[PDB]
């Protein structure tokens, strides 16, 4: 049998990768972050409450002018808010009520959403006729869609639940790079600030760094024990932090190819649905299933505050690009801007 | 105390509020029916008699609008999008009776895995199940030719269709962990037989009765 000896050269390849990243491992991040001082108990209050959603929130994405945000829900509604004056700017009726993700374009021209009909639809917000229309309706996946995030106004990467991330081009509609390599059902996606790299996580407890332009899996991180649910990418470009169903968040790192910090607490029995980072990256903010967001001193792993404001499970979460505010959506269908 | 631009923005958000409220009060009156079951269970035939990605079917019957979500084309992990289907009114499980001895591992054993997995699920603990039992004529000319004891070796019975069909019905009914909350409805039909929407209507009007007590605080 040649395939059993070939999988044991794969096994010894796993042995060189693991003792390489353990031979390069000298100090846990807590062992040098003892000399920094903690932020301590900080309080963030519900500055705004954004009601108008009736079924459960599944995603949210802040604008790059840090004032607008979009939110997708189970009732077939994509709603763009002014978060300042609580004003609803647009309300987009979806063709599929089952949507699991949304994004807002970096130029602000577009929103995406996608769900259980396996299509990330692209919506044109700035329209000469006034109403939001569907620009390009991207059907190329065989499984449900778990994240789709804009790179430019013309490039969008799309996680899906058929082991396949996919880089698209929105004039053509055809995927230009298909990212394969996951074993089951990719859940999340987070772009780099220079937009040359992205990460993704899946049911095989593996987080993989991808390269956008050339198209192969640059790195792979296996630290979790269950389904990774959502992922977030640190603002420096050099790290990312992810979140899974075993109530644990992990801070990995791209240039060192390993794990740095573990963000679990024994009082949490239930998984994460979203993570995002602060402007400095000092706060990691994790949504949860015990109905409240936690805040994490992202260098010290403390539980420095809890954004308990929701009746049901927090789905989604996000910080503005100037770091001014945190919006958290949830299954009781109430976006709360925090500050 | 604000400008006329911000005053017309508040009026824009108010009419967006009115349109969302009337859309949600429209959409809380249709009946959502999650159709599950294996692929060769005759589910296309029941779509033509109740009438890629997820498949949605629309039909109305006696002033009640139904929404049927055939989700068999989602060949992925069930857990994520099965938590996205709580709050559904009733579940239409479909088991073909003819596939007791027919190969894929046997098909009744996989159907009992699916039925046990959706009855014991956390997200379906108050959900009525309208279990259909399909292709009964092929069960007739498969039980007059071959015994069911190939499928169920711990079954000793009369080996006619009535007693063996009641036996596999009770093996499907016994898969609950909790029999006091969920209420499983079971029907026998074939492709020729006509009135099969009425059994669905009776099961959903019983769970509309229970939800109308929950609306009125009782």
């Amino acid at each position, epitope marked *: 049998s040649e395939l059993d000896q070939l999988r044991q050269e794969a096994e010894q390849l796993k042995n060189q990768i693991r003792d390489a990243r353990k031979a390069c491992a000298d100090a846990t991040l807590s062992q040098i972050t003892n000399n920094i001082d903690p932020v301590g108990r900080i309080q963030m209050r519900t500055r705004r409450t954004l009601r108008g959603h009736l079924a459960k929130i599944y995603a949210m994405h802040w604008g790059t002018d840090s004032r607008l945000l979009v939110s997708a829900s189970q009732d077939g509604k994509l709603i763009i808010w002014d978060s*300042y004056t609580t*004003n609803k700017v647009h309300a987009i009726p979806l063709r599929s009520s089952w949507v699991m993700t949304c994004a807002y374009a970096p130029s602000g021209n577009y929103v995406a959403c996608g769900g259980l009909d396996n299509i990330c639809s692209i919506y044109n917000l700035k329209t000469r006729e*006034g109403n939001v229309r569907v620009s390009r309706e991207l059907a190329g996946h065989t499984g449900y869609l778990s994240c789709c995030r804009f790179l430019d106004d013309n490039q969008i990467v799309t996680s899906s639940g058929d082991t396949t991330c996919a880089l698209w081009d929105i004039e053509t509609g055809q995927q230009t790079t298909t990212f394969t390599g996951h074993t089951g059902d990719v859940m999340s996606l987070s772009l780099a600030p220079d937009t040359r790299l992205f990460v993704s996580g899946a049911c095989d407890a593996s987080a993989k760094l991808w390269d956008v332009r050339e198209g192969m899996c640059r790195q792979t991180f296996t630290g979790h024990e269950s389904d990774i649910n959502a992922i977030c990418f640190f603002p420096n470009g050099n790290a990312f932090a992810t979140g899974s169903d075993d109530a644990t968040c992990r801070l990995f790192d791209l240039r060192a190819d390993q794990e740095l910090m573990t963000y679990s607490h024994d009082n949490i029995i239930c998984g994460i649905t979203s993570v995002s980072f602060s402007k400095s990256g000092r706060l990691l903010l994790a949504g949860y299933d015990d109905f409240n967001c936690n805040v994490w001193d992202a260098l010290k792993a403390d539980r420095a505050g809890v954004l308990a404001g929701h009746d049901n499970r927090v789905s989604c979460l996000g910080v503005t690009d100037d770091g001014m505010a945190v919006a958290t959506g949830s299954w009781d269908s109430f976006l709360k801007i925090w500050n | 105390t604000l400008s*006329a631009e911000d*005053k017309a*923005a508040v009026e824009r958000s108010k009419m967006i509020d009115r349109n969302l409220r009337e859309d949600g009060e429209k959409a809380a009156r249709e009946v959502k029916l999650l159709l599950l079951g294996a692929g060769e269970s005759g589910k296309s035939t029941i779509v033509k008699q109740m009438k890629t990605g997820i498949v949605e079917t629309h039909f109305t019957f006696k002033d009640l609008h139904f929404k049927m979500f055939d989700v068999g084309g989602q060949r992925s992990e069930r857990k994520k999008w099965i938590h996205c289907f709580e709050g559904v009114t009733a579940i239409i499980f479909c088991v073909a009776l003819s596939d007791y001895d027919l190969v894929l591992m046997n098909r009744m054993h996989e159907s009992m895995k699916l039925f046990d997995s959706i009855c014991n699920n956390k997200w379906f603990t108050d959900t009525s199940i309208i279990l259909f039992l399909n292709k009964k004529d092929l069960f007739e000319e498969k039980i007059k030719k071959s015994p069911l004891t190939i499928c169920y070796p711990e079954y000793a019975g009369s080996n006619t269709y009535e007693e063996a069909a009641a036996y596999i019905q009770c093996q499907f009914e016994d898969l609950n962990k909790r029999k006091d909350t969920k209420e499983i409805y079971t029907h026998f039909t074939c492709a020729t037989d006509t009135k099969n929407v009425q059994f669905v209507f009776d099961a959903v009007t019983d769970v509309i009765i229970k939800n109308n007590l929950k609306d009125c605080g009782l």
Partner: single-chain antibody, 233 residues
Framework: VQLVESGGGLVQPGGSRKLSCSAS????????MHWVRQAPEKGLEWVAY????????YYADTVKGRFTISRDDPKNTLFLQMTSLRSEDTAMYYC??????????????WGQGTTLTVSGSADIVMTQATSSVPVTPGESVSISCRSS???????????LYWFLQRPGQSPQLLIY???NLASGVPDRFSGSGSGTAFTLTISRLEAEDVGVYYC?????????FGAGTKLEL
């Protein structure tokens, strides 16, 4: 997007005319609507405003309660109905749309126009520096307009507009809210200033910039214009 107005002509003094503007080709039921008129040799003057879905109607403080506006959504037609037409009511009526959310461009697209001939203390007034400017093509042009009370509101948005009526043509929008430039207009234009002290900086004038430039405040109603600057060669 087309907004073809209808009606107009000549009418007796004391008469009535239902002046119409039928919209076509866009999502009319979510746009606030206006009418802005002008004299045959003076600047623009505002008529009325109805918001989308008929929620709010303001009127001119010149004529309030005599003019009446009406909005039809299934036919996408706006009417203006007018009663007892005085000697002031020989003017050039225009059918303006706008939309008001965050990031919107109010007062962008304008109707074709109709003519109809017939035989104030707390209002912020706009005063322009001139009425005619001779400047050759190629070099930088500055057009300044005055306000009587400061246009910066505490949110930050400074409600000063810059239109352009080409000679013989309908107005367009150049700069909405004092510094933000409307799409469909080339990026040579800019405008800046602090409160009441504002200038329209035009760089690299070619032959399409001839025409009369207008400045409008929108802190409150009425919507008062300046005289306008005729640019010619």
């Amino acid at each position: 997007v087309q907004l073809v107005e209808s009606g107009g002509g000549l009418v007796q003094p004391g008469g009535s005319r239902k002046l119409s503007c039928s919209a076509s080709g866009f999502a009319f039921s979510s746009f606030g609507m206006h009418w802005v008129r002008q004299a045959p040799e003076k600047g623009l003057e505002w008529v009325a405003y109805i918001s989308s879905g008929s929620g709010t109607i303001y009127y001119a403080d010149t004529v309030k309660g005599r003019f009446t506006i009406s909005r039809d959504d299934p036919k996408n037609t706006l009417f203006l109905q007018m009663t007892s037409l005085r000697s002031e009511d020989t003017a050039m009526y225009y059918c303006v749309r706008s939309i008001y959310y965050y990031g919107s461009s109010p007062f962008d697209f304008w109707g074709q126009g109709t003519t109809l001939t017939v035989s104030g203390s707390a209002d912020i007034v706009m005063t322009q520096a001139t009425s005619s400017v001779p400047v050759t093509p190629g070099e930088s042009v500055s057009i300044s307009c005055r306000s009587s009370k400061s246009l910066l509101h505490s949110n930050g948005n400074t409600y000063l507009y810059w239109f352009l009526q080409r000679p013989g043509q309908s107005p367009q929008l150049l700069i909405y809210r004092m510094s933000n430039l409307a799409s469909g207009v080339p990026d040579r234009f800019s405008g800046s200033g602090s409160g009441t002290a504002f200038t329209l900086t035009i760089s690299r004038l070619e032959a399409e910039d001839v025409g009369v430039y207008y400045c409008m405040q929108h802190l409150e109603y009425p919507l008062t214009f300046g005289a306008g600057t005729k640019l010619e060669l």
